[PDB]
Write an enzyme that holds these catalytic residues in place. Structure first.
Site, PDB file in Angstrom:
ATOM      1  N   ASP A  70       4.139  -9.327  -5.452  1.00 51.44           N
ATOM      2  CA  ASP A  70       5.188  -8.363  -5.106  1.00 51.44           C
ATOM      3  C   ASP A  70       4.842  -7.702  -3.774  1.00 51.44           C
ATOM      4  O   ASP A  70       4.056  -6.749  -3.729  1.00 51.44           O
ATOM      5  CB  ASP A  70       5.321  -7.327  -6.225  1.00 51.44           C
ATOM      6  CG  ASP A  70       6.591  -6.506  -6.122  1.00 51.44           C
ATOM      7  OD1 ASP A  70       7.232  -6.550  -5.050  1.00 51.44           O
ATOM      8  OD2 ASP A  70       6.942  -5.817  -7.115  1.00 51.44           O
ATOM      9  N   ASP A  95      10.354  -7.589   0.622  1.00 53.81           N
ATOM     10  CA  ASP A  95       9.974  -7.420  -0.779  1.00 53.81           C
ATOM     11  C   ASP A  95      10.209  -8.717  -1.546  1.00 53.81           C
ATOM     12  O   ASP A  95      11.360  -9.096  -1.795  1.00 53.81           O
ATOM     13  CB  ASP A  95      10.769  -6.273  -1.402  1.00 53.81           C
ATOM     14  CG  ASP A  95      10.374  -6.005  -2.834  1.00 53.81           C
ATOM     15  OD1 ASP A  95       9.334  -6.540  -3.270  1.00 53.81           O
ATOM     16  OD2 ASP A  95      11.101  -5.265  -3.527  1.00 53.81           O
TER      17      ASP A  95
HETATM   18  C1  LIG Z   1      10.579  -1.211  -0.850  1.00 58.04           C
HETATM   19  C2  LIG Z   1      11.366  -1.007  -2.114  1.00 58.04           C
HETATM   20  C3  LIG Z   1      11.142   0.301  -2.737  1.00 58.04           C
HETATM   21  C4  LIG Z   1      11.751   0.629  -3.938  1.00 58.04           C
HETATM   22  C5  LIG Z   1      11.537   1.860  -4.525  1.00 58.04           C
HETATM   23  C6  LIG Z   1      10.706   2.785  -3.919  1.00 58.04           C
HETATM   24  C7  LIG Z   1      10.068   2.486  -2.717  1.00 58.04           C
HETATM   25  C8  LIG Z   1       9.189   3.499  -2.047  1.00 58.04           C
HETATM   26  C9  LIG Z   1       9.820   4.554  -1.402  1.00 58.04           C
HETATM   27  F1  LIG Z   1      11.174   4.572  -1.406  1.00 58.04           F
HETATM   28  C10 LIG Z   1       9.160   5.565  -0.763  1.00 58.04           C
HETATM   29  C11 LIG Z   1       7.780   5.549  -0.769  1.00 58.04           C
HETATM   30  C12 LIG Z   1       7.093   4.526  -1.400  1.00 58.04           C
HETATM   31  C13 LIG Z   1       7.767   3.490  -2.043  1.00 58.04           C
HETATM   32  C14 LIG Z   1       6.950   2.377  -2.740  1.00 58.04           C
HETATM   33  O1  LIG Z   1       5.594   2.815  -2.829  1.00 58.04           O
HETATM   34  C15 LIG Z   1       6.964   1.040  -1.980  1.00 58.04           C
HETATM   35  C16 LIG Z   1       6.794   1.131  -0.476  1.00 58.04           C
HETATM   36  C17 LIG Z   1       7.269  -0.118   0.235  1.00 58.04           C
HETATM   37  N1  LIG Z   1       6.528  -1.293  -0.187  1.00 58.04           N
HETATM   38  C18 LIG Z   1       5.454  -1.729   0.487  1.00 58.04           C
HETATM   39  O2  LIG Z   1       5.201  -1.450   1.639  1.00 58.04           O
HETATM   40  O3  LIG Z   1       4.688  -2.509  -0.281  1.00 58.04           O
HETATM   41  C19 LIG Z   1       3.449  -2.951   0.319  1.00 58.04           C
HETATM   42  C20 LIG Z   1       7.305   2.317  -4.290  1.00 58.04           C
HETATM   43  C21 LIG Z   1       7.136   3.599  -5.124  1.00 58.04           C
HETATM   44  C22 LIG Z   1       7.459   3.366  -6.614  1.00 58.04           C
HETATM   45  C23 LIG Z   1       6.731   2.145  -7.141  1.00 58.04           C
HETATM   46  N2  LIG Z   1       7.004   0.992  -6.296  1.00 58.04           N
HETATM   47  C24 LIG Z   1       7.644  -0.116  -6.714  1.00 58.04           C
HETATM   48  O4  LIG Z   1       8.017  -0.249  -7.868  1.00 58.04           O
HETATM   49  C25 LIG Z   1       7.878  -1.207  -5.706  1.00 58.04           C
HETATM   50  C26 LIG Z   1       8.989  -2.153  -6.136  1.00 58.04           C
HETATM   51  C27 LIG Z   1       9.327  -3.182  -5.089  1.00 58.04           C
HETATM   52  N3  LIG Z   1       9.364  -4.534  -5.634  1.00 58.04           N
HETATM   53  C28 LIG Z   1      10.504  -4.701  -6.544  1.00 58.04           C
HETATM   54  C29 LIG Z   1       6.555   1.202  -4.926  1.00 58.04           C
HETATM   55  C30 LIG Z   1      10.312   1.244  -2.135  1.00 58.04           C
END
Ligand SMILES: CCc1cccc(-c2c(F)cccc2[C@](O)(CCCNC(=O)OC)[C@@H]2CCCN(C(=O)CCCNC)C2)c1
Ligand SMILES: CCc1cccc(-c2c(F)cccc2[C@](O)(CCCNC(=O)OC)[C@@H]2CCCN(C(=O)CCCNC)C2)c1
Ligand SMILES: *[C@@H]1O[C@H](CO)[C@@H](O)[C@H](O)[C@H]1NC(C)=O
Length: 337
Positions: A223, A35
């Site tokens: 991001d 990330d």
């Molecule tokens: C990877 C960090 C993170 C933080 C909070 C939630 C999640 C998350 C989860 F826990 C379960 C399912 C889905 C998610 C996310 O959709 C990101 C998946 C991993 N990232 C990825 O593969 O990106 C290509 C989040 C759901 C809420 C919104 N969101 C974020 O705000 C991401 C923040 C990370 N950068 C700071 C995505 C992941």
């Protein structure tokens, strides 16, 4: 040095890209998201109560099973848009690709079900700068740069489109350089506004012909942990009205038959037009007029100091291979293939 090591990534449904790291002696294995929008490493801890269902569903780090483990115990809390994980700091050897580093990471003892009960991954490897690191802990790429092993002080990302019934490569990150097998042409480089955040100047956002948004400039966080592109609520409300998209509790939808007729969306970065067609930003599960299809775009109001800002996530990186340049403090883009 001359090392440019790579990590194969898994693609779960175009919304979760994760790879493997190993922690401790012998190595304990975790699927983690890399990330660029956060700067701490964390994995679930064995000391996490089974009351948290996420800690029952995911892999747990056991400090007492590692000879290279070194106790710290200082409490750590990580703030995200969705909420909060909590735990304590620990130190152990972490292997990523062919590179091993002694790293201070969070052992997490509070994982809320929303959202981590929907995570196909276990933890997060933060690729941001120490300026954003909670506890001012040294981020993992900082320690890797300290080893003088990388050919160049850069790392790069490739997110593939999800393939069903095929073994296509889900994704790949490269530590030390970039993989020309996954980008065509040359990189177009854009300088960071400031060191400490993978964020660049943006000059406008176009719905087809008209520059509907961000005419006098806004911010763009690149991001790698964001699944969708995001913008402020104000911007996204105007963007979706122009697209004729309806909002539900979770997502923005259009009728699936109307998806391919949707206009392009162009992001103006570094004097160049970065365009995403409806085939890039719509989850086109069907083409039925009696079914609604999700757009990979939503609103997220990021507070100061990082925000207000757009987030260019997997929706964007799927089309543009991205190189994060630490030495020259810039971000490179080249068309993905
Ligand atoms: C990877 C960090 C993170 C933080 C909070 C939630 C999640 C998350 C989860 F826990 C379960 C399912 C889905 C998610 C996310 O959709 C990101 C998946 C991993 N990232 C990825 O593969 O990106 C290509 C989040 C759901 C809420 C919104 N969101 C974020 O705000 C991401 C923040 C990370 N950068 C700071 C995505 C992941
Ligand atoms: C699918 C509807 C939706 C819309 C917005 C957010 C979420 C959501 C959530 F509310 C909590 C956790 C995780 C998610 C998502 O991961 C969206 C990613 C967060 N956006 C982002 O990157 O913000 C910066 C979804 C969880 C279910 C699967 N998913 C889909 O998009 C499925 C679409 C496929 N339909 C055929 C992601 C889901
Ligand atoms: C935990 O980390 C801090 C430095 O960030 C250090 O001062 C402290 O001694 C560490 N704790 C242990 C047990 O080493």
């Amino acid at each position: 040095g001359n090392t440019t090591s790579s990590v194969i990534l898994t693609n779960y449904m175009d919304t979760q890209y994760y790879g493997e790291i190993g922690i401790g002696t012998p190595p304990q294995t975790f699927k983690v998201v890399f990330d660029t929008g956060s700067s701490n490493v964390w994995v679930p801890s064995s000391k996490c109560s089974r009351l948290y269902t996420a800690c029952v569903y995911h892999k747990l780090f056991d400090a007492s099973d590692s000879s290279s483990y070194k106790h710290n115990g200082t409490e750590l809390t990580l703030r995200y848009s969705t909420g909060t994980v909590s735990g304590f700091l620990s130190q152990d050897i972490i292997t990523v690709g062919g590179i091993t580093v002694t790293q201070m990471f969070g052992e997490v003892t509070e994982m809320p079900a929303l959202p981590f009960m929907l995570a196909e991954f276990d933890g997060v490897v933060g690729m941001g700068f120490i300026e954003q690191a909670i506890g001012r802990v040294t981020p993992i790429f900082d320690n890797i740069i300290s080893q003088g092993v990388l050919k160049e002080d850069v790392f790069s990302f490739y997110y593939n489109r999800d393939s069903e019934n095929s073994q296509s490569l889900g994704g790949q990150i490269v530590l030390g350089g970039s993989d020309p097998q996954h980008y065509e042409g040359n990189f177009h480089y854009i300088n960071l506004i400031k060191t400490g955040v993978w964020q660049i100047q943006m000059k406008g956002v176009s719905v087809g012909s008209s520059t509907l948004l961000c005419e006098d400039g806004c911010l763009a966080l690149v991001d790698t942990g964001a699944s969708y592109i995001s913008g402020s609520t104000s911007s996204i409300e105007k963007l979706m009205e122009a697209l004729g998209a309806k909002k539900r509790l979770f997502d923005y939808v259009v009728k699936c038959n109307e998806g391919p007729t949707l206009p392009d969306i162009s992001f103006h970065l570094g004097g160049k037009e970065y365009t995403l067609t409806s085939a890039d930003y719509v989850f086109q599960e069907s083409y039925s007029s009696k079914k609604l299809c999700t757009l990979a775009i939503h609103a997220m109001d990021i507070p100061p100091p990082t925000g207000p800002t757009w987030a260019l996530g997997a929706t964007f990186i799927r089309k543009f291979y991205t190189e994060f340049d630490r030495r020259n403090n810039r971000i490179g883009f080249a068309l993905a293939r």
